[PDB]
Structure 1
């Protein structure tokens, strides 16, 4: 009957890096005017908490209001396994809708990172490809980025984590540059952030030898 509720987790980067602030988002959908007021109760580890900022119903394309509540979460709260629960009261739901979300359970494993240069075969082309291989990590949640002598490079795509035969995960990030950029001997870096690394960071560099 609705409304339907979805609850989302912090992007990993926010959680891993102290500078940033992570948050858990509770999204509510399909809300009628006849029943447009929505209540939020937020819980951490079953103890209610108060510090969430509910945004305004933003009415949708399809004649439905949309509401959202955001909670601000501590870093060592989330990385420690805490359960975050959202309870939505509304005058169309007979009983409130609880959705809860938490970190992925299991021993963490520190990823090993490798950068791989372009295939000789590739050079014949306008642009070459640079590959960052991250493998050996649990949980799936990781952040991977590229940069060239300081700026974030902007032509890379990353494949979603792949479950390895050994219970760890892996991924490949392909950064695309111009062969000209390549020969000169420019320095390129693949940047990896995961909970299982010191400082929740490591860097691996790729240029010509």
Structure 2
């Protein structure tokens, strides 16, 4: 029978009131023979009725993919409410229930450090600006770079790594062309920061 996956909102969306955080219930391997699928949504077990179901997509393996999207309130997500997606289909015996919520436990503020390229790296045409983000909890976080107020997007960021004290860390690497707008900033968004946002700059 078909299978269900339930996805949390993107971290950046929960942390800024101007954005729209969402929970996404994805159904895979929906067949032509049994192609009707229903959705019930529950917030802390309380049925909700504001979910919107997206258009199914026939996949190259002759299966169907169905998606239901529920908008959540920023503070419901951040206060630890649970969201339950129930999927009904007559090919499945019982309805499938999946639940998700923010990780439990005391949020911890990230410390942000910018580290310049090793002197050795300059023997290459591009050097790496590093941003160490450590000690945060939970692991939901967003990291971006900018210079002179505009985004710098030639960066990659590691996933969060569980550290030995139960907090998380990550690094973000901005690749720059060695000439050094000599001022670069690492921007970090996390629920435990004041105004959910902080910047740490790097001279060159």
What is the TM-score of this pair, normalised by structure 2? 0.96
More displaced 10-residue stretch of structure 1: 92-101 or 160-169: 160-169
After superposition, the C-alpha distances for 1:17-69 in whole angstroms (9 at most, x for unaligned) are 11100000000011111110110000000000011110122111111111000
Q: Aligned partners of 2:166 and 2:56: how far apart in 1?
A: 42
Contact 1:185 1:207 in 2 (8 A): no
Report the counterpart of residue 184 of structure 1 in structure 2.
Answer: 180
Contact 1:143 1:192 in 2 (8 A): yes
Q: Aligned partners of 1:64 and 1:165: how far apart in 2?
A: 43
Q: Aligned partners of 1:29 and 1:162: how far apart in 2?
A: 29
Q: Aligned partners of 1:101 and 1:39: how far apart in 2?
A: 19
What is the TM-score of this pair, normalised by structure 1? 0.94
| Aligned residues between the structures | 202
Contact 2:148 2:181 in 1 (8 A): no
Contact 1:3 1:30 in 2 (8 A): yes
Contact 2:185 2:200 in 1 (8 A): yes
Q: Aligned partners of 1:204 and 1:136: how far apart in 2?
A: 16
Deviation at 1:120, TM superposition (A): 1.3
Deviation at 1:124, TM superposition (A): 2.1
Describe the SS at the equivalent of 1:87: strand
Contact 1:27 1:68 in 2 (8 A): yes
Indicate the RMSD between aligned Cα atoms, in angstroms: 1.1
Distance change in 2, residues 1:111/1:64 (3 Å): same
Distance change in 2, residues 1:43/1:113 (3 Å): same
After superposition, the C-alpha distances for 1:131-163 in whole angstroms (9 at most, x for unaligned) are 000001111111111112122212111111111
Deviation at 1:184, TM superposition (A): 3.9
Report the counterpart of residue 88 of structure 1 in structure 2.
Answer: 87
Deviation at 1:185, TM superposition (A): 5.9
Contact 1:146 1:191 in 2 (8 A): yes
User: Which portions of structure 1, spanning 4 or more consecutive aligned residues, are displaced by more than 2 angstroms?
Assistant: none
Q: Aligned partners of 2:180 and 2:169: how far apart in 1?
A: 31
Output aligned runs, 1:145-156, within 5 Å. Answer: 145-156=144-155
